[PDB]
């Protein structure tokens, strides 16, 4: 009745650590009944490492909590693949990233931001890189009582905002802001540990003489930003200047040097000179320019918006029994974004074709089994499936 | 007796402007007597633009001082080439860059540097890019009397230094440094205009609580530096931290991940964490790592040193009369650095060979004239010459 096919398939990235570990559930379907092997995505199946990686039974692969010295990347940092084979052929579950992590002494800091009296400011905390993948700001705090809770950009008209990305965006800064500390507070997506920051940053108001001019730090002059659909985000324009600058957001028209001012609304709001947006629609992608200006000078910052969607792969049809030397209607239905390239293969073996519809005009005996599209990309991947019954 | 050959040849880059303009002297040698054409280095000779470019007579090409609206890049920003041809063939003078510039309202600024009490600091002045090629710092000044003169790195043991590159390097910063202004003072290599800076920067001492850690701004974490032989320069390591950090300079061994601490001497001195060096010898080139450390944390900065020399090209020999179907001893003598690629050609026409010794094993009639090596690179170029008399 059935060739193979995936019911319980492993959501791509899967992370964990010593002091908790993990194990990975892949079970397949068919009506002989698909034998789940676990392999590296490089063809070869996985063995058994005493004290860490070990082939369980009940549709999974267990990574024991491990002595912090039993970490070895060959095990704890690899791409695995549920192999799903029967007598009609085999299929490979999409890239599943094992990432065991040694819990280690982390802590975020809150620096001083140095500001020209009257300008706005954006404080990040910082979260060292190694944990940065699983430690994210969830609060801010005054030395004077106040809390600044994250949001999906609910309110807009006000001195304080926590950006979608967890920085605290002060709309303007009087000197009356230099007596008061701020600490940030991440939380661990794995352990669950809420913890404050080793230090707390003070605001340094610097009163200006006469005038100054707007300019920007190199790592603020060229920004790249990725967000997912229907989620909220913000575009930044980090400039200072006395007197205070005017920020002008324009979107470019695709593949031109002509541009088009960013219209503001209930969806698109600017707390100058930052853009803050909800419902991250897919047209939103593209390139943006922020143009900042005062009586003394000007400046600008390009920014590249890449809104992303949940991509997919499915063939058309999932089962085609042919006739001995026929066509091959092997299209694949879709939605999602971005695709960095779709792939093809048959029975655990990569073939070579890399386009929408697969077709081998003259069928064969060794030309039947399971064929799968692979809609990859840089930070993810989805998969499809098709079997070739015969006449 | 002679084929062509260059006596008065035009030193590569040559710059000037409206309100002064220029004109370019190329005269050639031989004993018929080489006719100096002026061409674009793209084969085609240059004509006569009323009011700007104009073929003079007495071995030159005059670029009249021009109304600021008579600038047109097709004239005032191109590569020209004295063509030197007789009856024995032609030669092309090396790339000579015409750069007419519209004098325009320039002015440099001196910013505040924000410093953790006790740390060192480096102030640059912000000579905008357009003039930056011809406006360079030649002084620094206190609001309190003092002058900080440039040097080739004479003294070392002291709080203040002007780096080879005209930044003022304060060795350390007490809070007693926040009442006092500094202005810098460039001078124009063309006009001759000494002028101060639109504004003058104050030192902002920030007293630390407990501790902090050393870290670095992205545009300081990966440095590239070029200097010429026998001149003086400095390697930078821009890090702050309380308590105050230790900076450790190491040179790498070429093409390894192993390294070797930078030894200090009369030549190589460190005002931590900066290196400051005179007599820029050619071994000096290479990669360097600065390693900075305190009880709270660490950090590092790679740096790439490319000491340069005055390259040259000369063939071996400058005249060879052959025999009808002979070898070709066309080697080229040398010193200099770096070469981005040597070139070859014959009689104003590029041929295709790009290596040390030219040779066409079977000579011909249309295979005699002048042959020239072209030892180019990115910010310069030198040239060679050879003629083929016959039997
Ligand atoms: C072995 C285990 O399951 N738990 C350990 C935990 O006790 C420790 O905090 C860490 C070692 O640094 O690694 C993990
Ligand atoms: C920094 C770290 O994770 N080390 C921990 C240590 O604090 C603890 O005594 C032990 C408990 O299991 O695990 C390990
Ligand atoms: C890196 C780090 O924080 N080290 C921990 C520390 O909390 C403590 O000295 C001890 C408690 O058992 O375990 C270890
Ligand atoms: C001031 C004004 O009217 N527009 C200027 C524009 O000409 C320039 O491209 C830019 C420079 O940063 O700043 C803005
Ligand atoms: C035409 C000429 O020879 N001199 C002019 C100078 O008067 C002026 O300062 C500038 C125009 O901005 O360009 C040059
Ligand atoms: C900014 C600039 O260069 N403009 C000058 C202007 O100041 C002067 O009146 C004239 C004198 O030749 O040339 C032009
Ligand atoms: C750009 C600039 O500085 N403009 C100059 C200014 O010095 C003056 O208004 C005038 C003097 O003739 O010429 C013009
Ligand atoms: C502190 C020490 O002993 N050496 C460290 C080294 O392990 C590290 O590579 C670097 C990190 O920035 O700082 C230095």
Is any Cβ of chain B less than 8 angstroms from the Cβ of A105? no
Q: Please answer whether residues A323 and A391 qualify as being in contact, where contact means their C-beta atoms are separated by less than 8 angstroms.
A: yes
Measured CA to CA, the distance from residue A51 to residue A71 in angstroms comes to 10
Cβ A217–B212 below 8 Å, yes or no?
A: no
Q: How far is CA B226 from CA B49, B125, B165, B232, B376, in A?
A: 38, 20, 11, 11, 17
- Looking up residue B40, the CATH number of its domain turns out to be 2.60.40.10
Scan for tokens 């042959």, then name that residue: B371
Same domain for A128 and A71, yes or no, is: no
- Of the residues A125, A127, A182, A212, the best mutation for testing chain B's interface (the one with the most B CB atoms within 10 Å of its CB) is A212
Question: For the residues of B221-269, what is the DSSP string, one character each?
Answer: SEEEEEEETT--EEE----B-SS--EEEEEEEPTTSS-EEEPPP-SSEE
**Is residue B90 exposed (0-12), middle (13-18) or buried (19+ Cβ within 10 Å)?**
buried
Q: Identify the domain boundary among A256, A288, A310.
A: A310
For the CA of B298, the closest atom of ligand 8 is: 12
- A343 and A294: one domain? no
d(Cα B220, Cα B216) in Å, to the nearest integer? 6
Considering only CA atoms, which of B34, B24, B35 is closest in space to residue B3? B34
Question: What does the alpha-carbon distance between residue A205 and residue B154 come to, in Å, rounded to a whole number?
Answer: 38
Find out whether A277 and A235 touch, Cβ atoms under 8 Å: yes
Helix (H, G, I), strand (E, B) or coil at B176: helix
For residue A16, the ligand closest to its alpha carbon is 1
Out of A283, A310, A337, a domain closes at A310
Q: What range defines the domain where residue A356 resides?
A: 311-391
Query: Is residue B131 helix, strand or coil?
Result: helix
Q: Does A218 sit within 8 Å of B210, measured CB to CB? A: no
Residues in chain B whose C lies over 2.5 Å from the next residue's N (breaks after): none
Q: How far apart are CA B306 and CA B285, in angstroms?
A: 5
Indicate the burial class of B252 (C-beta count within 10 angstroms; 0-12, 13-18, 19 or more). Answer: middle
Could you tell me which of B58, B56, B55 has the C-alpha nearest to residue B8?
B58
What residues pair up with B302 in beta bridges, in sequence order?
B222, B289
A74 and A142 assigned to the same domain: no
CA distance B118 to chain A (A): 17
Please indicate, yes or no, whether residues B53 and B148 belong to a single structural domain of this protein: no
B324 by Cβ neighbours in 10 Å (0-12 / 13-18 / 19+) ranks as exposed
- A235 bridge partner residues: A275
Residue among B109, B112, B212 minimizing CB distance to A206: B112
Is residue A338 reached through a cis peptide bond, with omega within 30 degrees of 0 on the bond before it?
yes
Shortest Cα distance, chain B CAs vs residue A183, angstroms: 14
| B20 shares contact with chain A (CB less than 8 Å) | no
Residue linked to tokens 């460190």 = B270
Least CB–CB distance from A112: residue in B112, B206, B218: B206
- Pair A329, A381 in one domain: yes
Task: Give the whole-angstrom CA distance, residue B70 versus residue A342.
Answer: 55
Q: Which residue, of A46, A74, A102, is where some domain finishes?
A: A102
- As for how many domains chain B has, the answer is 4
> Is any atom of ligand 4 closer than 6 Å to the C-beta of A299?
yes
**Residue A171: half-sphere exposure toward Cβ, Cα within 13 Å:** 12
- Do B95 and B11 lie in one domain? The reply is yes
Report the SS3 class of residue B219: helix
Mutate to test the pocket of ligand 1, among A19, A130, A131, A191 (most ligand atoms within 8 A of CB): A19
* CB B19 near ligand 5, within 6 Å: yes
CA–CA gap between residue B312 and residue B316 (Å, rounded): 13
Q: Please give the DSSP secondary-structure letter assigned to residue B215.
A: B
A290 and A348 part of one domain: no
Question: Looking at beta carbons, which residues of chain B come within 8 Å of A209?
Answer: 199
Is B288 within 8 Å of B302 (Cβ atoms)? yes
Give the long-range contacts of residues A215-218, CB within 8 A, separation 24 or more. A215/A239, A215/A240, A215/A241, A215/A297, A215/A299, A216/A299, A216/A301, A217/B217, A217/B219, A218/B218, A218/B219
Q: Distance from the CA of A285 to the center of ligand 4, in angstroms?
A: 25
Residues A56 and A36: their CA atoms lie apart, in Å, by 11
Answer whether B67 contacts ligand 5 (Cβ < 6 A): yes
Query: Residues B97, B109: one domain?
Result: no
Long-range contacts of B37-44 (CB under 8 A, 24+ apart): B37/B82, B37/B83, B37/B84, B37/B85, B38/B80, B38/B81, B38/B82, B38/B83, B39/B80, B39/B81, B39/B82, B39/B83, B39/B92, B40/B78, B40/B79, B40/B80, B40/B81, B41/B79, B41/B80, B41/B81, B41/B92, B41/B95, B42/B79, B43/B348
Regarding whether A11 and A84 lie in a shared domain, the answer is yes
Q: What are phi and psi of B369, to 5 degrees?
A: 160, -130
User: Min CA distance, A204 vs chain B (Å)?
Assistant: 9
- If asked whether residues B203 and B242 sit together in one domain, one would say no
From A210's Cα to the closest Cα of chain B, the distance in A is: 9
Q: Is A306 in the same domain as A354?
A: no
Closest among A155, A118, A122 to A140, alpha carbons compared: A122
Mutant choice from B109, B178, B180 vs A, greatest count of A C-beta within 10 A: B109
Q: Is B121 in the pocket of ligand 8 (CB under 6 A)?
A: no
Same-domain check for residues A97 and A164: no
What ligand is nearest to the CA atom of residue A101? 1
């Amino acid at each position: 009745q059935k060739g193979p096919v995936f019911l319980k398939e492993p959501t791509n990235r899967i992370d964990f650590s010593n002091s908790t570990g993990a194990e990975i559930e892949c079970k397949a379907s068919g009506n002989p009944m698909p034998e789940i092997i676990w392999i590296r995505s490089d063809g070869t199946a996985v063995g058994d490492v005493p004290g860490l990686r070990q082939i369980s039974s009940d549709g999974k692969l267990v990574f024991p909590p491990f002595r912090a010295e039993d970490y070895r990347q060959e095990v704890h940092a690899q791409v695995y693949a549920c192999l799903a084979r029967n007598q009609f052929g085999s299929i490979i579950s999409r890239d599943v990233h094992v990432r065991a992590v040694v819990i280690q002494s982390y802590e975020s800091e809150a620096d001083n931001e140095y500001v020209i009296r009257g300008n706005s400011v954006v404080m990040k905390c910082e979260i060292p890189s190694y944990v940065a993948d699983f430690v994210f700001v969830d609060l801010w705090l005054d030395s004077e009582g106040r809390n600044y809770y994250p949001n999906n950009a609910a309110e807009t008209d006000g001195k304080y905002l926590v950006l979608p990305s967890g920085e605290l965006h002060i709309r303007e800064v009087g000197p009356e802001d230099g007596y008061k500390s701020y600490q940030c507070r991440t939380k661990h997506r794995l352990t669950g540990e809420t913890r404050l920051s080793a230090t707390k940053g003070r605001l340094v108001i610097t009163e200006p003489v006469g005038s100054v001019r707007p300019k920007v730090n190199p790592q603020d002059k060229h920004q790249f930003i990725d967000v997912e659909l229907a989620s909220s985000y913000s575009l930044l324009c980090m400039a200072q200047s006395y007197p205070t600058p005017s920020f002008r957001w324009y979107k470019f028209i695709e593949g031109t040097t002509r541009k088009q001012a960013v219209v503001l609304n209930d969806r698109v709001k600017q707390v100058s000179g930052t853009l803050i947006i909800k419902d991250a629609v897919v047209e939103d992608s593209g390139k943006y320019l922020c143009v900042v200006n005062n009586s003394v000078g000007g400046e600008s910052v390009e920014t590249v918006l890449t809104v992303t969607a949940p991509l997919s792969a499915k063939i058309d049809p999932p089962t085609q029994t042919v006739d001995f030397g026929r066509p091959a209607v092997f299209t694949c239905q879709y939605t999602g974004n971005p695709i960095k390239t779709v792939s093809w293969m048959k029975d655990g073996k990569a073939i070579g074709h890399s386009e929408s519809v697969l077709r081998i005009e003259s069928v064969k005996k060794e030309d039947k089994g399971m064929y799968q599209c692979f809609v990859r990309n840089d930070r993810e991947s989805a998969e499809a499936s098709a079997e070739l019954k015969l006449g």
